[PDB]
Amino acid sequence: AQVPSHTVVARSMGGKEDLIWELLNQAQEHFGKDKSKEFQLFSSPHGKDLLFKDSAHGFLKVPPRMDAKMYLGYEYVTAIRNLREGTCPEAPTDECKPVKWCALSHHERLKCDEWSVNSVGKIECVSAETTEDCIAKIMNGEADAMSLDGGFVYIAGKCGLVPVLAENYNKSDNCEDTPEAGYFAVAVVKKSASDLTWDNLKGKKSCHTAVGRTAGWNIPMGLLYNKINHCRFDEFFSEGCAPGSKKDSSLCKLCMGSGLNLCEPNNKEGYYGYTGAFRCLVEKGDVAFVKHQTVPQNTGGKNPDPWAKNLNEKDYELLCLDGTRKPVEEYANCHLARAPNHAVVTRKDKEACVHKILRQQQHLFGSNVTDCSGNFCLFRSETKDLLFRDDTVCLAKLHDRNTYEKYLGEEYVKAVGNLRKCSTSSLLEACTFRRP
Amino acid sequence: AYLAPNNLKPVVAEFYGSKEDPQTFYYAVAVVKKDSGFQMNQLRGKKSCHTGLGRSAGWNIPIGLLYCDLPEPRKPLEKAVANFFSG
Amino acid sequence: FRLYWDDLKRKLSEKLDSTDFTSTIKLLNENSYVPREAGSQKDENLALYVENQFREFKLSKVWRDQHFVKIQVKDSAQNSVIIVDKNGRLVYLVENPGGYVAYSKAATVTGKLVHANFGTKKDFEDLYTPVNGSIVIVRAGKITFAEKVANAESLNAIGVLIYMDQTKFPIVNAELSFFGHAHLGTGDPYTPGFPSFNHTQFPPSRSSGLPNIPVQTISRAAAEKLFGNMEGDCPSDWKTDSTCRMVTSESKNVKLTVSNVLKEIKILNIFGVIKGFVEPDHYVVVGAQRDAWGPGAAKSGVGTALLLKLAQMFSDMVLKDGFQPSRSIIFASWSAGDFGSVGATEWLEGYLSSLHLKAFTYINLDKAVLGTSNFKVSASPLLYTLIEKTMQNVKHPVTGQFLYQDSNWASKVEKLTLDNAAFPFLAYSGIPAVSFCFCEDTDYPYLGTTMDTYKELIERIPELNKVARAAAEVAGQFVIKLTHDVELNLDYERYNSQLLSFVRDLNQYRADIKEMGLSLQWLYSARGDFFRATSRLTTDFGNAEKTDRFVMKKLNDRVMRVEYHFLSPYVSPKESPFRHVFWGSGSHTLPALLENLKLRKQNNGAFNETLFRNQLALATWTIQGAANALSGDVWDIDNEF
Amino acid sequence: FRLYWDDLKRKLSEKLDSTDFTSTIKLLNENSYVPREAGSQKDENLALYVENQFREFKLSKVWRDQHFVKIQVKDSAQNSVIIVDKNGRLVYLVENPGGYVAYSKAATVTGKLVHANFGTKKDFEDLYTPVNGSIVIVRAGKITFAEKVANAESLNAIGVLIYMDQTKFPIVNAELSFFGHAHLGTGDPYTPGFPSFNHTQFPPSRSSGLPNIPVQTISRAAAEKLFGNMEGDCPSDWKTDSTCRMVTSESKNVKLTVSNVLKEIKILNIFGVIKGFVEPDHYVVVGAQRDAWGPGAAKSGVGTALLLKLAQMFSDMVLKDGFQPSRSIIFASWSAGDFGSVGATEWLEGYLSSLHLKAFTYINLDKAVLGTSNFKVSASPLLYTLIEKTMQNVKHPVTGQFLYQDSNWASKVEKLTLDNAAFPFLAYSGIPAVSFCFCEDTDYPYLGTTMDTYKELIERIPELNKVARAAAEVAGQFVIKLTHDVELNLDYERYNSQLLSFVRDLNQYRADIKEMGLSLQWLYSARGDFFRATSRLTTDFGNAEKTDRFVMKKLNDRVMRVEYHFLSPYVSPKESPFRHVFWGSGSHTLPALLENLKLRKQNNGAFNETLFRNQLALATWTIQGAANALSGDVWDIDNEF
Numbered sequence A: 001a002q003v004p005s006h007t008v009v010a011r012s013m014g015g016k017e018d019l020i021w022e023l024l025n026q027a028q029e030h031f032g033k034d035k036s037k038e039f040q041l042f043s044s045p046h047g048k049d050l051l052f053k054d055s056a057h058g059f060l061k062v063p064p065r066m067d068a069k070m071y072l073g074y075e076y077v078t079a080i081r082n083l084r085e086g087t088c089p090e091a092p093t094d095e096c097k098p099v100k101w102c103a104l105s106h107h108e109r110l111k112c113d114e115w116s117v118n119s120v121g122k123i124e125c126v127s128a129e130t131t132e133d134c135i136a137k138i139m140n141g142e143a144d145a146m147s148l149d150g151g152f153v154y155i156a157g158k159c160g161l162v163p164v165l166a167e168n169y170n171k172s173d174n175c176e177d178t179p180e181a182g183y184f185a186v187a188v189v190k191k192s193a194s195d196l197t198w199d200n201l202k203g204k205k206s207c208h209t210a211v212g213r214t215a216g217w218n219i220p221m222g223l224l225y226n227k228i229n230h231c232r233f234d235e236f237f238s239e240g241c242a243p244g245s246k247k248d249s250s251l252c253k254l255c256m257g258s259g260l261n262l263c264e265p266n267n268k269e270g271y272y273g274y275t276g277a278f279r280c281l282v283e284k285g286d287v288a289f290v291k292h293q294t295v296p297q298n299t300g301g302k303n304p305d306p307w308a309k310n311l312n313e314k315d316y317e318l319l320c321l322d323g324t325r326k327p328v329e330e331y332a333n334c335h336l337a338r339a340p341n342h343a344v345v346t347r348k349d350k351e352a353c354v355h356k357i358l359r360q361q362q363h364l365f366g367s368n369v370t371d372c373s374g375n376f377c378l379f380r381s382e383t384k385d386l387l388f389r390d391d392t393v394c395l396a397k398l399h400d401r402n403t404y405e406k407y408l409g410e411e412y413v414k415a416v417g418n419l420r421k422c423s424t425s426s427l428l429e430a431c432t433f434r435r436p
Numbered sequence B: 001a002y003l004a005p006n007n008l009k010p011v012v013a014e015f016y017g018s019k020e021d022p023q024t025f026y027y028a029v030a031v032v033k034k035d036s037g038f039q040m041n042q043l044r045g046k047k048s049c050h051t052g053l054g055r056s057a058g059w060n061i062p063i064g065l066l067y068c069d070l071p072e073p074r075k076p077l078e079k080a081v082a083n084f085f086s087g
Numbered sequence C, D: 001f002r003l004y005w006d007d008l009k010r011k012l013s014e015k016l017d018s019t020d021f022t023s024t025i026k027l028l029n030e031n032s033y034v035p036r037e038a039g040s041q042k043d044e045n046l047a048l049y050v051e052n053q054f055r056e057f058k059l060s061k062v063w064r065d066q067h068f069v070k071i072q073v074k075d076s077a078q079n080s081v082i083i084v085d086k087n088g089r090l091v092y093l094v095e096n097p098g099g100y101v102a103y104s105k106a107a108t109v110t111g112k113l114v115h116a117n118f119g120t121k122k123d124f125e126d127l128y129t130p131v132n133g134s135i136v137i138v139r140a141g142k143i144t145f146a147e148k149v150a151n152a153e154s155l156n157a158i159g160v161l162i163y164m165d166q167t168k169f170p171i172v173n174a175e176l177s178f179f180g181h182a183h184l185g186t187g188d189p190y191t192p193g194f195p196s197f198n199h200t201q202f203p204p205s206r207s208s209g210l211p212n213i214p215v216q217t218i219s220r221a222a223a224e225k226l227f228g229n230m231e232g233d234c235p236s237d238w239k240t241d242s243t244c245r246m247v248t249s250e251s252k253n254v255k256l257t258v259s260n261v262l263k264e265i266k267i268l269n270i271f272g273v274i275k276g277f278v279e280p281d282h283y284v285v286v287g288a289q290r291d292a293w294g295p296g297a298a299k300s301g302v303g304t305a306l307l308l309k310l311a312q313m314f315s316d317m318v319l320k321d322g323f324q325p326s327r328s329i330i331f332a333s334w335s336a337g338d339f340g341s342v343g344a345t346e347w348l349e350g351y352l353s354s355l356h357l358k359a360f361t362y363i364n365l366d367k368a369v370l371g372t373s374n375f376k377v378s379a380s381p382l383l384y385t386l387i388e389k390t391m392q393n394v395k396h397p398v399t400g401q402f403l404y405q406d407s408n409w410a411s412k413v414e415k416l417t418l419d420n421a422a423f424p425f426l427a428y429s430g431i432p433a434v435s436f437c438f439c440e441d442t443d444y445p446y447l448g449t450t451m452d453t454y455k456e457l458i459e460r461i462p463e464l465n466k467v468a469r470a471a472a473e474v475a476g477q478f479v480i481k482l483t484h485d486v487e488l489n490l491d492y493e494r495y496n497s498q499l500l501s502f503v504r505d506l507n508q509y510r511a512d513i514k515e516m517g518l519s520l521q522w523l524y525s526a527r528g529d530f531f532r533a534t535s536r537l538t539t540d541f542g543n544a545e546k547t548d549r550f551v552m553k554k555l556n557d558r559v560m561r562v563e564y565h566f567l568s569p570y571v572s573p574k575e576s577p578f579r580h581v582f583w584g585s586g587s588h589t590l591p592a593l594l595e596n597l598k599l600r601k602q603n604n605g606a607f608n609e610t611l612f613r614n615q616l617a618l619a620t621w622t623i624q625g626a627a628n629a630l631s632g633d634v635w636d637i638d639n640e641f
């Protein structure tokens, strides 16, 4: 079998990490690979394998997100734990243990617990606070599956998770078998600011869904990465609201949640998501980056919220990439790029059980259930997109395409790959240290 | 190491190949004398040399491969390993 | 040298193959001990016998305990049931019963008699003739005597007569008379909540679970003469004879005299502890009844026998073979368990502060051998996984097959009834408890009975040594499996299915709860928080070190107090003692919340709505409170804000 | 390197010599925060200020907590006290009070007025004119407002007016108006026993400690106009003016209108914990009030100031100087302590299961600085020896002499009154608690008052930085002395003198107890068993090893639960919450047993005898029960047999 490297350990709180890495780095550059004939770091005459291996040839920094349980991987931790305890598992494939779905930040937990009781017991809820913690919680084993957009299905695909089911966003008599081509990503501006152009967005206020999402982050900032040639985007825009950013940027200086819940990438922030970014555009923004169906859901008096009842579907307008100004009703003229649908991800060994429990579960609580208040609906939520996106008709079966690079398609994977050197999420770094 | 109350954490790993291609993993192998005349199935009751209790390529991979062939009781581990090997 | 599990069950089996239970069961039916009521002389002779045995086995400590209770015994005058004609000149006697009902009110009554098949509240609902101002007759079964007398008292009857019929109880003799008690709830009733020592100086109190009506057990041949005068055929749904009739004829009516006196007696509980080697003050209590009204070979003989032989086995393993338990073991002999288990209740109410969070399991040896067919177990769910492993390692006495034959046995487990001795350990004090019986499909035909001897037990069951050997193997494997390891084998995740079943049973009535303006959803979130608490504790067992002792003690304390935190704080322990929300009595428990909610849909108006709001608030915050206590510290608790 | 005690008090003194309390006390009296009622906007601004401070000091965890309570606020209509003549044509107004009484009943009444000096029950006993059907007036002092209104309600008065006189309260202004609450007992009254979250969904309940009569605070110059119409001179034993008179004249009588509304508001408690290094989950709570009706510089300013500066000091010692506490420390900021301390009571009733046997000390910073003369401390006796050592190490602010000047200070310590914030921590939850004040011989003249500002505080006390420095040194030396060592400094032998004083006070009445047929001697033997228990525990500290941790933990647990075992199990926690037998309210406590026994000798017949037998039984077995729990295991207990 293969094993991870030997490692230098340290304490969890007192550390100190930077001083060990400073010392071993400056030792590495002078004494490690035969730079000085006088002293050797990797050999000694009287004893061998002292203080280090003899077969080692250099040091690598462990990223700050990766702890021991992520360092060893899931298979090796399961091997050492079942070897130490001594179980030697049987695995009958008939029964299946219930699925530990992962939720986040108390607006997902209420609807998740209600779904755990409305189901007979097959679904149980374990939660986190940000989605990067919940992906790691799927990796370690405390969780089983969740629903992510393609920007995080890319990251969890790097960490070693596969997608099982996809979400359809168009109604049909046969939606469960028919694969969907994906939704569109648009930017929305107002009629009052008719001077705005895709050629010139500099110093204008931008509204994003969250850091790392497809229609909010990857598709716009990839094109802007081709134009600006800067990694930083707080310089091109004056202000804006992009949840999940660092606190020091102006991209958190326009957001609205308070206090200490500012730019938290969850439902505690008012400007999080698609609809929250639309509130960023209505209240304080100049441009928003959302999906193409954001304006018809929120406008027309469909939200019972006070901010959205007075909004009209006509006066907003969504701009193309050439510089033409074209209205909302035809999205097919003005789209930046095709974005793939949201998917349900899980580990490899729980692939079949999440498949069976979710198809069996969506037949009972799915889209045919009318009289939603007074009963339970899995997909219908209170306008905040809880556990799923509110326009999800059904979950399409994926056969022959269960891999992040297969499911996400070539153009979007290349589009994220042009933004590969620029992303600052620590979890992608921690999942990319594994690769030699 | 990372169990309570120790609560340690890995901070600096190391690579084993050339500096062109750093290799983080390494391979676990089982080295024997020539022409001893036994495969992995005929391993029972032979004298064994382990590199340490709990280490990766010496204990966990060799015991974990042949582990479910031992007779009950499996607990504690090194007792039944001590019966499987003749010294 | 050290002893692991698979050596240790082998050592126990090598001990059980040697011993002989039959000679001890015949010894406890000797002419020296054969009547032993509570406080009689022969009961103290058996007590000194058991104590000298506990000294001869060389246990680590042996101590007795005595306190003075009040029971009810027969008077020198005789109680009788006797037919009175309307003419009044001529009076015909039926019979003079040998047996009596404890804690019945000493009085004499006359009246018209009504058959009342079992006295179940549904059964009382479906009567033809109204019940009031009359004397009911019932058949013994399906519920305790006290619930029969309590229900017929609630419908304002005058008296209760109790018999045994052909179909439920097939026996040869029809003149057989028997014994019972009619105290709802357990314990000595004249000290409720506080113990019956001389330190309390005996203040005037009186429990609420005492009836006001005269009760009497009659024989079957007595019931024949009453059935000869009555009329109207029994319904065919009742599994009964052709003999029974509904109501008395217009001319004749019955007369019941009952004369009993309140005798104050002395009670001896006798205890013996084996110490532990790591944590000596945590322990597990094993106990069995010692007295019975008749000879009592089936009721209190096999319990005392399995107790003594288990003491010889465990003391033999500790002194010679090298078994070193990590935590102590208390063996106990309770007397006066026939009057509603007063030995255990006075022990618990006496020494509650001393065993608060120290004791953690009661294992009942009482009534371990009745039949040879089935295996019926009743426990708190913290023991459930434990019991399942034992059922995969114990071979049945008749056939060689294992006991784990049904993979859905957890859905058929019934709760602990009030007559069981482990119910004050579970409901009142919050200690997990287990009681198991080799029960036949029909119950044993004579428990509180004069004919219960050894010979009739050995014509019921052909061979007894292998059966009682199997029961001793189960209980000994419980005690070893608890106290051999550094990890307690209490499985706390079984409450998740109980809470799931409850919240599902409230989810059927979400429409009515929506009509009152109440939301149900906070109780959903409470059940969720209990799941996240138990899952976090399981991952804390995952990340802990098994050999270190200090990090395992902090995690075993939370497992020991997961039962205590279900005891509802908001009720008084003197007024309503059985205060466990899942298994208790009163208005605060969860089936009283469901049973209070079911009355709204019928629109009668016999339910109160403010009581339902208050029960939903306190039950919601009790489940939420245990869930917050189990999951870490204070600052790790995440409410909304 | 390691830090022992005599280095560590030196480090604390080096920290206190640097800081400046005066600027923070002036900051909490700024125009941004100067009115802050419970639930007002400025209270939430101060709350966010304290929370951002607790983040800037880099504490180990900072978390807030919010829940919705019901308080009573002024209506838009104005309440008034107004003289009505018998003629009725002409009506003269006295005054329109600025201040109001919380939880008074909103009503209007007329009637004849009677002076009722303090409303003490002895004071009510010695009235000349009978009290019923009338309006009493009292002077503020010697007891809480709620006990005044409760006593005058028990003698069936109609209304209560409360003022401040010359002699007790010497001030310049006579137009000064003030604030109070009239809830007997503590906590939010509309949720008794269960917490006020949204998880309970707000069921309809109502506490028993609410009056039915209208109460009002009036000014001194208002009381002058009432005294101008009355007649008959006050008795000379009353320390009072020449102005006061007894009853109203025959012609005129007063009219009181009070109009208040029940406003439902939001409450924020704000918490911050420093972790521990050995046993992180045992902790000690330090808290202080945050709101007040007026400006409140003396009432809630110095508490919040000492809280913030102690947080900076202990976080500064932990992060830099290397202080490593063995067990955690919680800092707390309670709001709405002006309405009878609802922040602490909702925190305790909410999270009771989570801090059951975990928290072990409350240290009150509230009202720490009033005067500069004396030092008045009130605590549970487990802290007494602790306090004595602190009084030998803290130098007085004015003179250089130490605080330990009286070697018999333990006989002058008064119990905790109901208005103190540590009383729900002591009586209800069973956690030891301490509250200390630099109190002048006469009390501070204006607490719940509009004139309480900073400037008037700094004309009362000439220099304030050294005084508040001394108070911060005392509290910090408490916290260090608890959490620096492996041995808790709770001294459990102080209960021996309390039990000795009680049994002596019953030994005066041994003749009457002999007349009822009761023996007293079992209570003698109970007190003896408590002495043998504490002596055995002290010799167990003698034979233990100080460096080993497992043998010291088993001995620290018994010290932590010696307070919990005095909480009487036999009463309901919802009906009577304050259930500590020494310091509680109700019929189960020990001074209610003595006060019930004193009525027999007078031969009135207003006492019940069965209640006395029952109280003697339960109190005897409570003391005996704690004594058996403290002394080892079950089998080491020696009753007679």
Ligand SMILES: *[C@@H]1O[C@H](CO)[C@@H](O[C@@H]2O[C@H](CO)[C@@H](O)[C@H](O)[C@H]2NC(C)=O)[C@H](O)[C@H]1NC(C)=O
Pocket: A170, A171, A172, A173, A178
């Ligand atoms: C969205 O779905 C609708 C209805 O499901 C699609 O309408 C189709 O219209 C053609 C017209 O010739 C029919 O033959 C098909 O049967 C319809 N259904 C499907 C599933 O194709 C519509 O084309 C879809 N639009 C998008 C953008 O996906």
Ligand SMILES: *[C@@H]1O[C@H](CO)[C@@H](O[C@@H]2O[C@H](CO)[C@@H](O)[C@H](O)[C@H]2NC(C)=O)[C@H](O)[C@H]1NC(C)=O
Pocket: C068, C198, C264, C265, C266
């Ligand atoms: C303990 O309580 C018992 C029960 O009241 C007392 O025993 C009784 O004492 C009276 C005294 O004349 C006797 O007439 C009774 O027969 C006794 N009862 C029994 C059951 O024997 C006893 O005296 C009390 N005190 C002690 C020290 O045991």
Ligand SMILES: *[C@@H]1O[C@H](CO)[C@@H](O[C@@H]2O[C@H](CO)[C@@H](O)[C@H](O)[C@H]2NC(C)=O)[C@H](O)[C@H]1NC(C)=O
Pocket: C607, C608, C609, C610, C611, C612, C614
């Ligand atoms: C209605 O509910 C209450 C309790 O939920 C029952 O009795 C009341 O209980 C309170 C609190 O203990 C006490 O004030 C009295 O005991 C009762 N109050 C009354 C009668 O005003 C009551 O039995 C229930 N049922 C009905 C029909 O009122």
Ligand SMILES: *[C@@H]1O[C@H](CO)[C@@H](O[C@@H]2O[C@H](CO)[C@@H](O)[C@H](O)[C@H]2NC(C)=O)[C@H](O)[C@H]1NC(C)=O
Pocket: D068, D198, D264, D265, D266
């Ligand atoms: C918790 O309950 C309180 C009630 O005390 C809710 O607060 C009030 O809600 C009503 C209706 O939503 C409105 O009057 C105000 O929003 C609140 N009033 C006051 C005076 O605060 C609160 O919304 C509840 N919280 C949750 C999360 O349900």
Ligand SMILES: *[C@@H]1O[C@H](CO)[C@@H](O[C@@H]2O[C@H](CO)[C@@H](O)[C@H](O)[C@H]2NC(C)=O)[C@H](O)[C@H]1NC(C)=O
Pocket: D607, D608, D609, D610, D611, D614
């Ligand atoms: C006598 O003492 C009792 C206190 O124990 C008072 O009332 C009794 O209280 C108990 C409490 O459980 C009730 O069960 C009884 O029913 C009450 N007695 C009656 C007669 O109802 C009582 O106030 C005291 N005083 C008098 C004069 O009886």
Ligand SMILES: *[C@@H]1O[C@H](CO)[C@@H](O)[C@H](O)[C@H]1NC(C)=O
Pocket: A363, A364, A368, A369
């Ligand atoms: C729609 O949902 C209902 C809900 O029970 C189910 O009976 C039905 O089969 C579903 N129809 C389809 C086409 O899935």
Ligand SMILES: *[C@@H]1O[C@H](CO)[C@@H](O)[C@H](O)[C@H]1NC(C)=O
Pocket: C132, C133
């Ligand atoms: C009780 O029964 C008697 C006769 O059996 C009858 O007269 C009476 O009406 C009944 N009680 C009520 C309340 O109806």
Ligand SMILES: *[C@@H]1O[C@H](CO)[C@@H](O)[C@H](O)[C@H]1NC(C)=O
Pocket: D132, D133
């Ligand atoms: C209460 O006082 C009134 C005078 O207002 C008097 O008439 C009455 O007699 C008093 N009550 C009693 C019980 O005497």
Ligand SMILES: [Ca+2]
Pocket: C187, C188, C191, C192, C193, C194, C195, C196, C345, C346, C349
């Ligand atoms: Ca009792």
Ligand SMILES: [Ca+2]
Pocket: D187, D188, D191, D192, D193, D194, D195, D196, D345, D346, D349
């Ligand atoms: Ca409350």
Ligand SMILES: [Fe+3]
Pocket: A149, A150, A213, A214, A215, A342
């Ligand atoms: Fe998306």
